[PDB]
Write an enzyme that holds these catalytic residues in place. Structure first.
Site, PDB file in Angstrom:
ATOM      1  N   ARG C  54      25.653  60.921 216.776  1.00  0.00           N
ATOM      2  CA  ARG C  54      25.380  61.485 215.460  1.00  0.00           C
ATOM      3  C   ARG C  54      26.661  62.005 214.813  1.00  0.00           C
ATOM      4  O   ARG C  54      26.763  62.037 213.582  1.00  0.00           O
ATOM      5  CB  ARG C  54      24.331  62.602 215.521  1.00  0.00           C
ATOM      6  CG  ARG C  54      23.605  62.835 214.210  1.00  0.00           C
ATOM      7  CD  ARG C  54      22.692  64.064 214.269  1.00  0.00           C
ATOM      8  NE  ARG C  54      21.737  64.008 215.375  1.00  0.00           N
ATOM      9  CZ  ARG C  54      21.538  64.975 216.257  1.00  0.00           C
ATOM     10  NH1 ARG C  54      22.056  66.190 216.092  1.00  0.00           N
ATOM     11  NH2 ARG C  54      20.776  64.732 217.317  1.00  0.00           N
ATOM     12  N   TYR C 107      24.533  59.201 187.273  1.00  0.00           N
ATOM     13  CA  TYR C 107      23.612  58.247 187.844  1.00  0.00           C
ATOM     14  C   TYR C 107      22.216  58.859 187.945  1.00  0.00           C
ATOM     15  O   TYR C 107      22.051  60.007 188.364  1.00  0.00           O
ATOM     16  CB  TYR C 107      24.177  57.888 189.221  1.00  0.00           C
ATOM     17  CG  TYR C 107      23.427  56.845 189.987  1.00  0.00           C
ATOM     18  CD1 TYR C 107      23.142  55.602 189.435  1.00  0.00           C
ATOM     19  CD2 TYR C 107      22.999  57.108 191.265  1.00  0.00           C
ATOM     20  CE1 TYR C 107      22.441  54.649 190.166  1.00  0.00           C
ATOM     21  CE2 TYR C 107      22.314  56.184 191.983  1.00  0.00           C
ATOM     22  CZ  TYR C 107      22.048  54.955 191.423  1.00  0.00           C
ATOM     23  OH  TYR C 107      21.348  54.027 192.156  1.00  0.00           O
ATOM     24  N   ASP C 181      31.467  61.701 191.342  1.00  0.00           N
ATOM     25  CA  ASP C 181      31.016  60.392 191.823  1.00  0.00           C
ATOM     26  C   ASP C 181      32.041  59.386 191.317  1.00  0.00           C
ATOM     27  O   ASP C 181      32.137  59.114 190.112  1.00  0.00           O
ATOM     28  CB  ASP C 181      29.619  60.071 191.310  1.00  0.00           C
ATOM     29  CG  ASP C 181      29.080  58.763 191.851  1.00  0.00           C
ATOM     30  OD1 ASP C 181      29.901  57.859 192.145  1.00  0.00           O
ATOM     31  OD2 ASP C 181      27.836  58.627 191.958  1.00  0.00           O
ATOM     32  N   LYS C 206      29.103  49.687 196.987  1.00  0.00           N
ATOM     33  CA  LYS C 206      29.588  48.890 195.866  1.00  0.00           C
ATOM     34  C   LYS C 206      30.904  48.208 196.237  1.00  0.00           C
ATOM     35  O   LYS C 206      30.896  47.278 197.044  1.00  0.00           O
ATOM     36  CB  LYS C 206      29.663  49.757 194.594  1.00  0.00           C
ATOM     37  CG  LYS C 206      28.322  49.947 193.853  1.00  0.00           C
ATOM     38  CD  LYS C 206      27.247  50.546 194.699  1.00  0.00           C
ATOM     39  CE  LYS C 206      25.824  50.606 194.019  1.00  0.00           C
ATOM     40  NZ  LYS C 206      25.657  51.730 193.055  1.00  0.00           N
TER      41      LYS C 206
HETATM   42  C1  PLP Z   1      24.680  52.592 192.992  1.00  0.00           C
HETATM   43  C2  PLP Z   1      25.066  53.983 192.610  1.00  0.00           C
HETATM   44  C3  PLP Z   1      24.978  55.031 193.527  1.00  0.00           C
HETATM   45  C4  PLP Z   1      24.005  54.988 194.673  1.00  0.00           C
HETATM   46  O1  PLP Z   1      24.492  54.299 195.800  1.00  0.00           O
HETATM   47  P1  PLP Z   1      23.422  53.674 196.849  1.00  0.00           P
HETATM   48  O2  PLP Z   1      24.309  53.274 197.987  1.00  0.00           O
HETATM   49  O3  PLP Z   1      22.710  52.592 196.085  1.00  0.00           O
HETATM   50  O4  PLP Z   1      22.453  54.779 197.256  1.00  0.00           O
HETATM   51  C5  PLP Z   1      25.698  56.210 193.333  1.00  0.00           C
HETATM   52  N1  PLP Z   1      26.582  56.361 192.280  1.00  0.00           N
HETATM   53  C6  PLP Z   1      26.700  55.332 191.372  1.00  0.00           C
HETATM   54  C7  PLP Z   1      27.635  55.530 190.217  1.00  0.00           C
HETATM   55  C8  PLP Z   1      25.962  54.151 191.534  1.00  0.00           C
HETATM   56  O5  PLP Z   1      26.098  53.196 190.578  1.00  0.00           O
HETATM   57  C1  PLP Z   2      17.509  63.343 220.505  1.00  0.00           C
HETATM   58  C2  PLP Z   2      16.462  64.177 219.844  1.00  0.00           C
HETATM   59  C3  PLP Z   2      16.256  64.115 218.466  1.00  0.00           C
HETATM   60  C4  PLP Z   2      17.362  63.714 217.528  1.00  0.00           C
HETATM   61  O1  PLP Z   2      17.493  62.321 217.375  1.00  0.00           O
HETATM   62  P1  PLP Z   2      18.926  61.725 216.898  1.00  0.00           P
HETATM   63  O2  PLP Z   2      18.584  60.295 216.617  1.00  0.00           O
HETATM   64  O3  PLP Z   2      19.871  62.022 218.029  1.00  0.00           O
HETATM   65  O4  PLP Z   2      19.349  62.459 215.630  1.00  0.00           O
HETATM   66  C5  PLP Z   2      15.056  64.551 217.903  1.00  0.00           C
HETATM   67  N1  PLP Z   2      13.999  64.983 218.683  1.00  0.00           N
HETATM   68  C6  PLP Z   2      14.172  65.035 220.049  1.00  0.00           C
HETATM   69  C7  PLP Z   2      13.027  65.542 220.874  1.00  0.00           C
HETATM   70  C8  PLP Z   2      15.381  64.630 220.630  1.00  0.00           C
HETATM   71  O5  PLP Z   2      15.495  64.747 221.978  1.00  0.00           O
HETATM   72 BR    BR Z   3      17.736  52.039 190.842  1.00  0.00          BR
HETATM   73 CL    CL Z   4      22.759  50.329 189.961  1.00  0.00          CL
END
Ligand code: PLP
Ligand code: PLP
Ligand code: BR
Ligand code: CL
Ligand code: PLP
Ligand code: PLP
Ligand code: BR
Ligand code: BR
Ligand code: BR
Ligand code: BR
Ligand code: BR
Ligand code: BR
Ligand code: BR
Ligand code: BR
Ligand code: BR
Ligand code: BR
Ligand code: BR
Ligand code: BR
Ligand code: BR
Ligand code: BR
Ligand code: BR
Ligand code: BR
Ligand code: BR
Ligand code: BR
Ligand code: BR
Ligand code: BR
Ligand code: BR
Ligand code: CL
Ligand code: CL
Ligand code: CL
Ligand code: CL
Ligand code: CL
Lengths: 391, 391, 391, 391
Positions: C54, C107, C181, C206
């Protein structure tokens, strides 16, 4: 226009299913809903119907369609790497008693396949100088079956006169199988099949992948040769995985913009090296005076970024280490066609040993460069610092 | 213990770099920091030092180490699929004038490689019944170079007496190369190299991958044969991509728990079919009375889930459709070794056509089953509904 | 130079282990060989020692290093997409009672996060016109914690006078968190942190990915804000998978060549549209006369390929279909930044509804174009054919 | 039966397109061929029509269908990891002024999300002992919006009397949202929604992936709660990448065989530890006498392989190293659910610090084991050698 074709080749709804790129369909088993569907898939097992993963999935069919469009072929066979494409495409067209006629500048693994694999299977190999042109007719034997071209040549970069070679072959042996390793051109800067070559082979590992992180070979054949290539390579189990096929299709999309940069940068480096007092010779197809440059200018639509040059002296082992071990941007590795710049050295006798029945015409140490996507002035500064280490 | 070995094989820190599984190192170019590093990598290019992606990266080295440990070999060569492993492993050991002696129950693409590729390269192939045992000595010619086993046989599942075959071969031709397609055993339920076979070949596509979504071949050789296998397959450009190598290593980890389920379920289905009035014969290595069952019980440490049976009649085309088109859980596809159950049919003359110089001993339609991981009682209900459609 | 930096950013031996690109280390569990090693990893769990998936693996660390180098930050947090990066970066700095000041050209999902999530958690949001400049000072309340910029604005492309905005904020509320952004500039054509902005957020989806086949968000923070961003985003479980991190690093390597082509081609299209009789206005930051163009020219080092224009009329639903359904090269899809050209329509009333406390100043349909890597003369011919369908 | 369901869940032709497994569709942009198609996709953007990659591609839809079938839900939301699923599922249902009631045995990151994120947004959190049963009614306040269960508890493995808890909540606060972290049961050994729980959350990272090489969270909700979960998680940008969704679907196929082996082996280990002179207590839900065992026996259909035990003394730092550093088969790492066996130590004071408003009832070091797929006699020998190092 090539840039528009590279962006769109192989991208049809039956493969993309709504996304921009083809889906990645990972499979050995492909399921038949009914006996009649299984019979139809069997009949169409080499014609883009899902049958068995060794024949391909939607992801492979998309790549094959792209390659056929871009190289002007009837079919495209896929392989685990470039060397497999060369070895298996030659193997597909030979049998005991046949003769292969190969340029002496062929990539060394291609030569070694001929001498170490084909010979003991009863297939002989003869050699020709890459500038032989029309005089190749005098080397064609009654048993010559394959004529194998590589233009530019490996390492030393000599460009064939393909029209003269093809016309001469066709005058003597109209049915011979003419093949080319077209890796340096990425299959798109030299349209081999339009020149009457039968099969265009590439290490898609290089510029098609474009990032040094995937290995794959392709061979695009005309209609006369496709069925034999397809079925014989399949009998050797040749295929590529679906994910690398996807990454190859993906590489095509940026191939135009990459190649233009590789051409601009590498030609600038070549022009600079040609003026440099520590350089004896530059071997770059686009540089005036390079071997076969006139054919490059006539027959190609651009250059890539790989070339070589010969230093004004033979480096000692200590000078080789001082030179090669201390670059800041260039790095030592095999392969090429990626975003980063590479450097390797070979002494003349190393090249002579891979020029069968020939000698080399230089005595300085040869340096092979791949010019990547870095700023060219930074690359020039790195080369200049290298020259200062050996002056 | 096998389960502990399957969990740990090939997982060393130099490959995993802190994770449980090996890193995925995608590469053609492998970088040398210095000339001395490049020289060391060259010397060790087949011995697990990074040199060039065609030889492998850390991910391949990890898989190779796992396969050598589990199959008891000196080296493991990788291929794009099982068929490529068979074709190229045989090719690696033959030359014009040699003879191959292959079981007549070999997988059909293996036979077709011999008849359609090897023959025209001057390598002849002869055939033997899978139960020949010690009498194979009478078939060994002065030019026999390779003896090719497949136990159990494809489709019809006959088990060789490997000890008797190997002893007879070694009495006549001690230096012959004895190879086996050991796919059904996943290389682990039959420890081929411990029986004096030289090379154990698998379609890792099947149980090693285990999920029907990746294609790969392996060949594990003893010390006597490894260098020739390694270098000759490399001359043909044979390799697998790093990601499929990773997925193969990953498949090993669950292979024990999967195979035990495939054995339990498939033997229960076989025992039930053997009692069924619509079944003439069951071909399952673990079922008493099946061809070579005594050798399976003596020489193997378990079973997988693939087998076949012969119906009490020859189905018409209409009955074939009614039978095969209407299963709820079994599906029609080629390949096997995954989590789902599969069904295919072959008429006797189809099998006779792939039994060179032999006839078949049955007249009913043959059904080949792969028993997956579904609940066996649900699978039995599906088969029972199928029987009711053709009664 | 940027091109050399893009080729090399994040590519250190500890991540690449001999290949050109970083290894792909897929992991949840990261193994501690000793208790001493576990203690060191725990202490350094946010500082690039392997601790738990993580927090990241080698592949993430390499991307984070590259982003910090290219955007000049102290740390880079990774997210499942751009919208997650925006939402979670704002959330990481607010508490009940705080106020966010956001550009009304943000956005739409960013705005909706503020009005639909933050509002019910006691955080209020106010709005400003993108050309407000120094007059933003009058909108800063004592509880204003975050000032959120987006330049160019979404869809309508207005460029902020960032120097004037930042200086005003620092005069009235020096402790405020200023965020941008910076997706349109791909984080590299506008060096946000050098302007005194605290956090530069990007939808790496993007241009960084560049091929429309991955989703990922990034947020690069200065030293003042990094620990709070890192730890609060981690408490929300925000991360990206290792393979998409690899593909983002890989996209960096071609970002310079791609962006130069997107700039060249899109500016040519915008210049043509600006003279076209069916076009009322062109919104391209690099086109003289566009809103905020003078600030683009002063503060950016280039342009990307996304822009918009206003037709001389509002298209009815029937006219929108005739126009959009029949393009040959432009496709309809959301997102942008890839190799292919895209087209989307927004009616003026649709834009007004996402310009809080503001009205639009145009009456025709707005067409947003992403100009990809196709030949520009082919794209102009496609646009011209579109104009003929609505004349 | 579950095994048949696991093999088949989510595998419909519209997702698999001829292969056994779903295709991998990598996408941000999803292309609309017509304005009519874009309108239909917009209306159905949360209902399994291709609209935008943040909402999902075919690969996600297939996983979501599988999860809804196996856990009996109306919808399944996907997240970058388990901790993101917990944090964002709780956030999706709270607003300033609400109260969360959580078991004091909850996973520590879940608790830290409550105390460090929710608290500053005006949402308070209270705690309950895992064996509270019907007495939870007395802790429900008028503003209690969420009741958060985790059974077995993290680390210490206490099993809740879910029927008694749910019935009490529905008597006092029928509109409350009851959620469970159902990771230990892999969502399938405890059918949470059938017990009247509203949302079952899982770290698919653990047993669903099953190989320690992917991270992903899931949350399956009933019809009452689905729209709020779906839309509010989407406003936070929560999603998983298509490849990890594929690998989660793929992990389902072997989940039954794996879990049966984890249960068998872990119970054998727990039975041995329970008689061991250096063990004070064993916490395994399937072991008679463990806390809540009677509820496990009544309410679960099996066990997984994670459990813990308490040593007869607290190990010093030096003793912890002697014990943990020298195992041959068990490894130290966080997470669990994979093919390999893991060991981690927690000192009693460490556990007390993560049991809010409660004390621990043991004084020795707690050892948490994940029992993988290795041979159990080998694992017992490794534990026995560990005991010898601390005797
Ligand atoms: C596409 C867009 C996002 C969102 O990104 P995702 O990866 O689609 O969630 C954020 N900022 C701008 C300016 C965008 O055009
Ligand atoms: C490992 C753990 C998580 C967290 O999952 P991740 O994919 O590591 O974020 C949640 N619940 C339990 C019981 C866990 O042992
Ligand atoms: Br959208
Ligand atoms: Cl978009
Ligand atoms: C690299 C190379 C090959 C071999 O390709 P691989 O993918 O490395 O096997 C073939 N031809 C040429 C000209 C090459 O440079
Ligand atoms: C499937 C099969 C092969 C071929 O493997 P592929 O990976 O499909 O090329 C080889 N041997 C046997 C016994 C097989 O069943
Ligand atoms: Br051209
Ligand atoms: Br001659
Ligand atoms: Br001509
Ligand atoms: Br011609
Ligand atoms: Br070009
Ligand atoms: Br090489
Ligand atoms: Br050298
Ligand atoms: Br210079
Ligand atoms: Br065994
Ligand atoms: Br004989
Ligand atoms: Br013996
Ligand atoms: Br022996
Ligand atoms: Br077994
Ligand atoms: Br087949
Ligand atoms: Br049939
Ligand atoms: Br029955
Ligand atoms: Br620059
Ligand atoms: Br510890
Ligand atoms: Br069941
Ligand atoms: Br529209
Ligand atoms: Br943790
Ligand atoms: Cl090379
Ligand atoms: Cl098969
Ligand atoms: Cl380093
Ligand atoms: Cl369907
Ligand atoms: Cl954990």
């Amino acid at each position: 226009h090539l840039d528009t074709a590279l962006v769109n080749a192989g991208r049809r709804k039956k493969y993309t299913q709504g996304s921009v790129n083809s889906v990645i369909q990972r499979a050995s088993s492909l399921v038949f809903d009914t006996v009649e569907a299984k019979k139809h898939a069997t009949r169409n097992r080499a014609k883009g119907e899902l049958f068995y993963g060794r024949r391909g999935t939607l992801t492979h069919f998309s790549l094959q369609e792209a390659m056929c469009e871009l190289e002007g072929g009837a079919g495209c066979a896929l392989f685990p790497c470039g060397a497999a494409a060369v070895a298996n495409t030659i193997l597909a067209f030979v049998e005991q008693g046949d003769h292969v006629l190969m340029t002496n500048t062929a990539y060394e693994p291609s030569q070694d396949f001929c001498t170490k694999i084909l010979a003991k299977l009863g297939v002989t190999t003869g050699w020709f100088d890459p500038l032989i042109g029309a005089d190749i007719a005098n080397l064609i034997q009654p048993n010559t079956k394959v004529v194998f071209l590589e233009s530019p040549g490996s390492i030393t970069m000599e460009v064939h006169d393909v029209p003269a070679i093809v016309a001469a072959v066709r005058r003597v042996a109209p049915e011979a199988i003419i093949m080319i390793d077209n890796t340096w051109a990425a299959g798109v800067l030299f349209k081999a099949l339009d020149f009457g070559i039968d099969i265009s082979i590439q290490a898609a590992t290089k510029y098609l992948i474009g990032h040094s992180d995937g290995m794959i070979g392709t061979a695009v054949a005309n209609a006369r040769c496709w069925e034999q290539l397809c079925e014989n390579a399949y009998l050797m189990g040749q295929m590529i995985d679906a994910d690398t096929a996807y990454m190859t299709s993906r590489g095509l999309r940026t191939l135009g913009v990459r190649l233009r940069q590789h051409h601009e940068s590498s030609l600038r480096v070549a022009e600079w090296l040609a003026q440099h007092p520590q350089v004896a010779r530059v071997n770059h197809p686009a540089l005036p005076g390079s071997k076969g440059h006139e054919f490059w200018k006539r027959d190609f639509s651009g250059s890539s970024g790989l070339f070589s040059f010969v230093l004004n002296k033979r480096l000692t082992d200590a000078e080789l280490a001082a030179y090669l071990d201390n670059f800041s941007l260039f790095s030592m590795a095999y392969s090429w066609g990626g975003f980063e710049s590479l450097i390797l050295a070979n002494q003349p006798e190393h090249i002579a040993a891979i020029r069968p029945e020939a000698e080399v015409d230089f005595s300085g140490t040869l340096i092979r460069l791949h010019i990547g996507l870095e700023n060219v002035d930074d690359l020039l500064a790195d080369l200049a610092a290298g020259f200062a280490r050996i002056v």
